[PDB]
Every structure is written in structure tokens, then in C-alpha cells.
Amino acid sequence: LNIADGHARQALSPGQQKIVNELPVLWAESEQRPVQQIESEAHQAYFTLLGQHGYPAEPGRVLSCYSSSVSMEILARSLSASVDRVALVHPTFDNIADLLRGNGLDLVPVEEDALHGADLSAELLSSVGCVFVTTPNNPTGRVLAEERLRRLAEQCAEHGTVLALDTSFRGFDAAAHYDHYAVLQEAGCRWVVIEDTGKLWPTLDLKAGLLVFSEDIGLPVEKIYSDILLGVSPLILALIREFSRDAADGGLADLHAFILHNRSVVRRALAGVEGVSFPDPESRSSVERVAFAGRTGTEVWEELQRHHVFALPCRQFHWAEPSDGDHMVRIALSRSTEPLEKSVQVLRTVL
Amino acid sequence: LNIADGHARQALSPGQQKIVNELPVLWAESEQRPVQQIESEAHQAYFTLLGQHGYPAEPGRVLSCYSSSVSMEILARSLSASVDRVALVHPTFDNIADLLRGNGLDLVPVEEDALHGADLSAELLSSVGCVFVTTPNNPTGRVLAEERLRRLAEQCAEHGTVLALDTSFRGFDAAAHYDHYAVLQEAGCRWVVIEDTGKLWPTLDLKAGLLVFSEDIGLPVEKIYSDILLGVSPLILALIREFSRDAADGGLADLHAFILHNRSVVRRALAGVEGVSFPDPESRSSVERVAFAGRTGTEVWEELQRHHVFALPCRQFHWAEPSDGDHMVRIALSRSTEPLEKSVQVLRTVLET
Ligand SMILES: [Cl-]
Ligand SMILES: [Cl-]
Ligand SMILES: [Mg+2]
């Protein structure tokens, strides 16, 4: 009973199963057509699905990568050409910190209340070459509102700072479906966005990271991209195109209802336990934090494993101060509902 | 007419096409079985296909990556933790130089005749922390023979040097199907091998790099791998397993005959042309170098493009001394024979003008 990894493992819907049954036809098409044409259609379907109508649609502006973490490796190594220190939201997906640190960047944490609630200070912005925001955030689900994105992009433009966004969880939360590219382009800051198809649908990790950047980004992202790959399989792009079209034709609303159902299953099973609470009441993401008293998430993780249930302690997401995550675990919701419910009834007994 | 990029674009064989038409079944299997089991089957089929029986088969010793270039990024960044300089075969696949340089490594070229024909000097081995060999080499097709691999591994063991091999072209040349892992493990050097499925078959870039390394590698490769990915799609692993089993069932013999046929097309179309020669007569790789005395590979490449044929000049592969490649172009052979023949016919016309 795995409730750890964020990638989707629930059953395909009937519409998605139809796409899988057409793989031999998508192969035929991918053999026959120029990859750039399938790529453009995949990008258009995915960006427009999620409200990002102002994305730059000229060939070459959106660089398709094998994954979002490959995009992040490209960006991190590019940043290291001209940047020493990066401001990074805390907590967040820890691979981002690992890839930045591994490419030689010093990291400055920005807590979520500072990031959403107020302008970044001049002292902070004057000490970093890049501000990095995951939105919706993993693990918290917190969405950077349009008014704050606009102010943050304006601040980065004044300070000469790169604004970088990781939007892997975008598909799960309609509040993240306002047009981010329209905001970024009107502010005129140096900007980069890493989109990701990989967390949305159960595609057996067939996915792309989509690296998008301003024309004045002033980092060697295109050169380093080209040292790592020429592009992704046209079959994967064709799959992204078809899953996005199924999503636009009702699949995405069904996904949101599914995640909401599983989130409610978790909260229903655990809410009666004294001292158990849900740190992110309004999250719509596919992962769910649970807080408890009297024990650590590491101890809960150890006990769950004895019962063959695999969840995640939260320490690792607090990449700057791990003890901040000591009294929480994270539960993956992109799972079939029956195994998920059995897992949380085990967690209920533990807590 | 593209005869530039080395990736395979020929039609599927009947055995491969059967696999493609069963892709929904591989999907169903991937939903039902643990990825680790499918992965182990995929590794077993690919390594044993190409004679690498001594590969480390314990789960987690072979790291599956999205591509061989992702494997190389992981290796390059891993090296930079403790290595400043790398000895690299020259010429070679010049992306390797770009990935190493981009991660802060300084490069020392080793010409092929020196690498294959004699021991490396002690002065080189005290000046580099890694020796990097592409075998079979791209673009030359030259294969590191077993006796020289053993001496290289022994020299690297004596000096605490990492021996790194990029074996993307292995499947094409039976001379590279002696067991490299047996040699490396007996020599006891620090070693890393990057296997690659992506050049063999027309799989629309559905592929894996396989990053394999010794237990004493002494580089943070496992950490950096895991910072970049958890693993590769079970569907791609199942595809690799199935293509490897088809290749074991006659498909690999058919592939060698197909490449030999296309190489023969190129050579018979150009051998009568004044000033043409083929520097790598014994190459069995899917790319082919062609030399000329009368003109520059760049000028030939430019004239080909006016006629809608896209090949590659060789300067780029001579990443340390580009003028060494000034009189050669490279031709991709993993192509349907008919377009390839059209391509080399334009080239013949250009060279005859
Ligand atoms: Cl995750
Ligand atoms: Cl190539
Ligand atoms: Mg080059």
C-alpha cells in the first residue's frame, strides 16, 4: 500500500483507456509527421487546457524535456553561469533544492507567509540572482495569486532578478489557471516557467517537462538544453496532446472531483483523532499533509512500514530547517480509493 | 533528405512492428507488475543480447535513465565533485565534450592510435582523474579490443583513475560483444559504463541510457541520479525487453545485414569518384565517414544543403583540433535504403562537379 510517491497510480478513465488502445495509430502518426507539428499541437492543447493562453507559441520558445527535473537540471546549471544565490520557497519539493545546490547555488529560504503576504525585502532581493516559486506548491498546495505574481514579477524586473516558477501541480487547482504568461510578459522581468505533465494523469511516467523562458532571460538555457537532448519522443507528445484533449472534454473536472473525493476520505478517517489536523485546509493538490502531536513523522513512517504502508515524513520538504516538518507526514492522493482508504485506516490506528 | 542525425529512422521490421501493435498490452502489463521486475527483465534481455553476461544484476546497480545524455550529465556532474581534468578520446561524439566542459572539467585529448596502440603514459594518468572512451567510437566505428581494455583498466587501477566507457554503438559491432564487465571487474579499477538503447532501433526516441558503475566508483553518482529521476517508464522498459528479445531471435542479425547493405550502397555510389576515400574500412557502425582531397567538409555540407540533403561535416567531432576533420563528412546509415540512395546520389553529383 504505497501512499508516498506523488505520481498518479489510479485507474485510467474510459476516455484515457481509449487513448491507450490507439497507441498503434499514434505511433503511425508519429512516424509520418514532423515532430515539430505534433509538438506544437501538444503544447497548444496543454497550455490552453490550463488557461495559459499567452504562452509563447513560436517554435523553439517552449523546450520539451524528458521530465520537469531534467528541465530543472538545465535551469540550475544555467543559473550557475551568472548567479551565486537563489531565494527558494520553503518548504517545497526537495529535488529543486538538491539540483540548485548540486550545481553550486547557495540557497536562501523564503517562507510561504513572507512570499504570499508581502513584497520581498530589498535586502533579500539584493542578495540573490533568482527567486524560485513552486505554484501550486508541493507539498502545501498553496497557490500564488495573480496579484502577488504581478507584484513579484514587477519587483524582479526592478531588481534585475530572474523569476522562476515550477507549475507541475497547475492542472489540479483552478486558482492556478489564470494566465501566468500574460502577467510575466506585461511585467517585463527575466522569467522562466517549468510546466510538467507528469503528476496529472496515470501515464506510467510518460511525460514531458516544458521549459519556457523570456527572450531576455540572459541564461544559457537553450545551449545547455541542446547538450542534454534534441527533443522528446513524438509518441509522448502525441499522448500529451490526446490526454489534454480528453481533459478539456470533461476529464479535468472528473479529475478534480476524484482528488476531492480522496482528500475527503483521508480527512473523514483522521479528523476525529485528538491533536490530528490538516495544515492545508484549502489545498486541491494530489498530496495531503497531516499533522499530529506527541510523535514525529519519522516515527509514524517507521510504524506504518511495519504494517506495509508507505507514506512520507515531511522533514525532507523543509529543505532549510528539517525539524519544521517533524510533526507532519504527506499522503499521496493520486491512488485508487480502496487502497487509499485501507492505508489511512492503518494510519488512524497508529496516530 | 536527412542523413545527419545518428538515430534510427528506417521502417520497423515485422518482428518489431508486432511489438508496436501490442503496445496496449505492454501498457496493461506495466499497470499490473512492479516496475522493478520489468526493469530487471529489460536489463537482462539487453545485456545478454550483446554478450555482457557479467553485468551487475542485483537490483539498483544498473540505473535506468531517460537517455544516455542524461546518464552523461549525471556522470559529468558527479566527476566534478573531485576530478578537474578528463582524458577523452579524440575524435568523438562532441556532446560528451560539451557536457564535461559545461560541468567544469578540463579536457585532454587522446588520439585513437595512441589509445588503442600503446599504454597511456604515467604523466597523463597523474594529470587526469578519468579516462573516457567511446567504443565503438562515434564517428569512426573503432572498437576497443579486449586486450587494450584490460590494460587500460589495469593502468586506471594502478593510478586510482576512473575508466568511463560510452557503449551506445555496441549493438552494431560484434567485436564489441566480448564481456566488458568481466574485464572491468577483474581489473578492479573504478569504472563506469553508459549503455544506450537509443541508436539501435526505430523506436521514436523511446529509449534508455543504462548507467552502470563499480561499487568503489567514489563519485556521488547515485545521489545525483536520484536528484534527477526516480526511474524510467515501465512501458519503455517493456519495449526495450521486447525489442531485445526480437533482436535475439534473428533481429540483430538482420540489423547488421541492413547496416552492411546501406554501407555498401554508400561506398559503391562514391568509390569511383576522384579524391574520395573511406577512412574506416572495417567500421560496422550506423554512421559512415567519407573523405575527399579536393575540398572541405564544410563546403560539401553547404552545397549538399542547397540540394536539400542534410549530412554533417566532421570538424565538430574533432573537439580539440577541428581542422583534423576538415576533409570529411559523416553519413547516417540508420535510414530506409531508398532515401539514403537518393542522398548519396546528390553527394556523388556534387563531388563530380
Ligand atoms: Cl511528489
Ligand atoms: Cl549521432
Ligand atoms: Mg561541438
Q: Between the CA of residue A326 and those of A47, A300, A301, A350, what are the distances in Å? A: 37, 10, 11, 16
The residues near A84 (Cβ < 8 Å, ≥ 6 apart) are A105, A106, A129
From the list B68, B40, B46, the residue with the least C-alpha distance to B196 is B68
Q: Is A286 helix (H, G, I), strand (E, B) or coil?
A: coil
- CA dist B76 and A105 (Å) reads 17
- CA dist A121 and A110 (Å) reads 11
- Beta-carbon separation of A233 and B67 below 8 A: no
Half-sphere exposure of B290 (CA within 13 A, CB side): 34
* Cβ contacts of A70 on chain B, cutoff 8 Å: 66, 70, 228-229
What's B157-219 look like in SS3? HHHCCEEEEECCCHHHCHHHCCCHHHHHHHHCCEEEEEEECCCCCCCCCCCCEEEEECCCCCC
Work out the angle at residue A233's Cα, subtended by the Cα atoms of residues B139 and A332, and round it to the nearest 5 degrees. 130
From the list A214, A160, A224, A222, the residue with the least C-alpha distance to A192 is A214
User: Residues A75, A196: contact at Cβ < 8 Å?
Assistant: no
Which residue do the cell numbers 484515457 mark?
Answer: A16
User: Residues B15, B249: contact at Cβ < 8 Å?
Assistant: yes
Work out the angle at residue B311's Cα, subtended by the Cα atoms of residues B307 and B314, and round it to the nearest 5 degrees. 135
Nearest CA in chain A to B236: A206
Cα(A6) to ligand 1 centroid in Å equals 4
- Beta-carbon separation of A230 and B95 below 8 A: no
Beta-bridge partners for B209: B65, B196
For chain B, give the longest Cα–Cα distance. Answer: 61
- Beta-carbon separation of A102 and B27 below 8 A: no
Residue B154: CB atoms within 10 Å: 17
Which residue do the cell numbers 476524484 mark?
Answer: A258
When CB atoms are compared, the residue of B67, B234, B235 closest to A66 is B67
Query: What method was applied to determine this entry?
Result: X-ray
Locate B268 and state its grid cell: 559503391
- CA dist A28 and B168 (Å) reads 26
User: What is the least distance, in Å, from the CA of B40 to any CA of chain A?
Assistant: 17
* b/e burial code for range B237-268 (CB count within 10 A of at least 16 → b): bbbbbbbbbbbeeebbebbeebbeebbebbee
Q: Would you call B233 an interface residue with chain A, using a CB distance cutoff of 8 Å?
A: yes
The B residues from 199 to 218 touching A (CB cutoff 8 Å) are 202, 204-206
DSSP A122-155: HHHHTT-SEEEEESS-TTT-----HHHHHHHHHH
User: Residues B55, B191: contact at Cβ < 8 Å?
Assistant: no
- CA dist B299 and B313 (Å) reads 9
Pairing of strands B276-277, B287-292: antiparallel
Q: Is A230 helix (H, G, I), strand (E, B) or coil?
A: coil
Give kind and range of the element (H or E) at residue A332.
Answer: strand A328-332
Half-sphere exposure of A62 (CA within 13 A, CB side): 26
Locate A193 and state its grid cell: 516557467
Q: Does domain A1-9+245-351 have CATH number 3.40.30.10?
A: no
Architecture field, domain B10-244: 3-Layer(aba) Sandwich (3.40)
Locate B293 and state its grid cell: 582531397
From the list A184, A89, A194, the residue with the least C-alpha distance to A141 is A89
Task: Give how far the C-alpha of residue B300 lies from the chain's centroid of Cα atoms, to the nearest Å.
Answer: 26
Handedness of CA A129, A180, A317, A80 (dihedral sign): negative
Q: Is B123 exposed, middle or buried (0-12, 13-18, 19+ CB in 10 A)?
A: exposed
Q: Would you call B197 an interface residue with chain A, using a CB distance cutoff of 8 Å?
A: no
User: What is the least distance, in Å, from the CA of B188 to any CA of chain A?
Assistant: 29
Per-domain boundaries in chain A:
1-9+245-351, 10-244
From the list A69, A337, A2, the residue with the least C-alpha distance to A228 is A69
Q: Resolution reached, in Å? A: 2.1
Backbone torsions φ then ψ of A87, nearest 5 degrees:
-80, 125
- CA dist A195 and A87 (Å) reads 20
User: Residues A241, A45: contact at Cβ < 8 Å?
Assistant: yes
Q: Which CATH class is domain B1-9+245-353?
A: alpha beta
Q: Would you call B32 an interface residue with chain A, using a CB distance cutoff of 8 Å?
A: no
The residues near B215 (Cβ < 8 Å, ≥ 6 apart) are none
